[PDB]
Design an enzyme around this catalytic site. Structure first.
Site, mmCIF file in Angstrom:
data_model
loop_
_atom_site.group_PDB
_atom_site.id
_atom_site.type_symbol
_atom_site.label_atom_id
_atom_site.label_comp_id
_atom_site.label_asym_id
_atom_site.label_seq_id
_atom_site.Cartn_x
_atom_site.Cartn_y
_atom_site.Cartn_z
ATOM 1 C CD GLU A 155 6.435 9.765 0.440
ATOM 2 O OE1 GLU A 155 5.243 10.135 0.450
ATOM 3 O OE2 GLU A 155 7.092 9.703 -0.624
ATOM 4 C CE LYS B 278 10.293 8.153 -3.199
ATOM 5 N NZ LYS B 278 9.530 8.970 -2.179
ATOM 6 C CG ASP B 279 7.919 3.623 -3.951
ATOM 7 O OD1 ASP B 279 8.323 4.270 -2.948
ATOM 8 O OD2 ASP B 279 6.857 3.993 -4.488
ATOM 9 N NE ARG C 267 -28.743 6.977 -19.609
ATOM 10 C CZ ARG C 267 -27.969 6.025 -19.071
ATOM 11 N NH1 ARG C 267 -26.642 6.054 -19.178
ATOM 12 N NH2 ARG C 267 -28.532 5.017 -18.417
ATOM 13 C CE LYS D 286 -0.302 9.954 3.012
ATOM 14 N NZ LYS D 286 0.686 8.816 2.918
ATOM 15 C CE1 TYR E 19 -1.898 12.614 -0.766
ATOM 16 C CE2 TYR E 19 -1.988 11.581 -2.872
ATOM 17 C CZ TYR E 19 -1.306 12.230 -1.909
ATOM 18 O OH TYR E 19 0.004 12.478 -2.110
ATOM 19 C CG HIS F 16 4.991 6.338 -0.350
ATOM 20 N ND1 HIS F 16 4.759 7.087 -1.478
ATOM 21 C CD2 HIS F 16 5.972 5.463 -0.669
ATOM 22 C CE1 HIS F 16 5.584 6.700 -2.433
ATOM 23 N NE2 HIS F 16 6.328 5.713 -1.969
ATOM 24 C CD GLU G 294 -22.893 16.174 -0.025
ATOM 25 O OE1 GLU G 294 -22.194 16.446 0.998
ATOM 26 O OE2 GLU G 294 -24.128 16.005 0.019
ATOM 27 C CD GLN H 171 0.226 19.037 -0.642
ATOM 28 O OE1 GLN H 171 0.556 17.982 -0.061
ATOM 29 N NE2 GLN H 171 1.115 19.940 -1.085
#
Lengths: 184, 184
Positions: A145, A170-171, A26, A74, A134, A65, A31, A50
């Site tokens: 990529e 693409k994938d 609740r 990442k 991320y 990727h 962190e 970024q």
């Protein structure tokens, strides 16, 4: 040594973090990142330039990727929902080259993974919807990529799935691990 | 400043009180609590709403208890027998987060401990039998009591013990400090 758990995985450079929580369902506070703990944990300095935030529905699998130029580490987590996140070691000479590890990260479990430069990354959404964020050490550039097809036979990844992934074109057109250029 | 001794411990907010006695072993009188001295000692107002009294045999260890919701400060003493009483600081950002202090309180030594909101509490009985009483600032609610296992490796508490604690199932099922939700 901490105040968020850090655990090296089968592939040591890949780390799973677990924040300590204060409060409860609740109200709670935690962190999500601490330069000090993170640097002590991974053994070297890191700069994040970024942050990326995304929303995807059940079964969406964005994946395998990596960027060889403008290489990136990442640090990933799920602020909403649940995904199964995967890391593949593509480092020239790595004893664990061609190996993968995967973990479920969710808003509930609050787990995160650090996936260093030299790895390929992917995740599939398991919940109705998932929000994924991320931090990277260098910017996502599409012109750089590369991609390895999610269902590659040699990697033989254990996608907790049981339904065909909704992939981007693409994938879908992803390279076979065998034909994949890898990291110097 | 007094007429009961007050001593801050390694963790400052945790205080040990020692009443002054009048008379001797065949008759004596002492003040077990004085709003004025207590408030001056701890530096702020306190209201006690419930007093709890218990009896437990040698080696019984009730422990590592705390409530995050309906948080409570506790002032504890032994009117019969001897226990070793322990306090653990679980306060978000506390310089002494994860630290513990412990003291023997007995009917003979008449010592008491104030253990503020934000700490986990426990004691083990060292005498044949012990009667324990405490005053709290809010009511004990089982639906809110969390628990850290008494023998947690990181806390590495110094239980003057030397025999296995007779624990309740609940306390046996206690969480590891590492996995413990803590206080906002």
């Amino acid at each position: 040594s901490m105040a968020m758990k850090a655990t090296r995985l089968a592939i040591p450079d890949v780390i799973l973090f677990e924040p300590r929580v204060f409060g409860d369902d609740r109200g709670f506070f935690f962190e999500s990142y601490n330069q000090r703990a993170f640097e002590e944990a991974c053994g070297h300095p890191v700069s994040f330039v970024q942050d990326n935030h995304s929303r995807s529905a059940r079964g969406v699998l964005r994946g395998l990727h990596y960027q060889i130029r403008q290489a990136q580490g990442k640090l990933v987590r799920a602020t909403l929902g649940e995904v199964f996140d995967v890391a593949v070691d593509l480092r020239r000479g790595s004893p664990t080259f061609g190996q993968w590890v995967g973990e479920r990260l969710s808003a509930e479990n609050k787990r995160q993974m650090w996936i260093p430069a030299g790895f390929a990354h992917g995740f599939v959404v398991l919940s109705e919807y998932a929000e994924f964020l991320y931090k990277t050490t260098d910017f996502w550039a599409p012109e750089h990529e590369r991609c390895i097809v999610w269902n590659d036979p040699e990697l033989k990844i254990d996608w907790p799935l049981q339904d065909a992934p909704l992939l981007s074109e693409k994938d879908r057109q992803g390279k076979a691990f065998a034909d994949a250029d890898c990291f110097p």
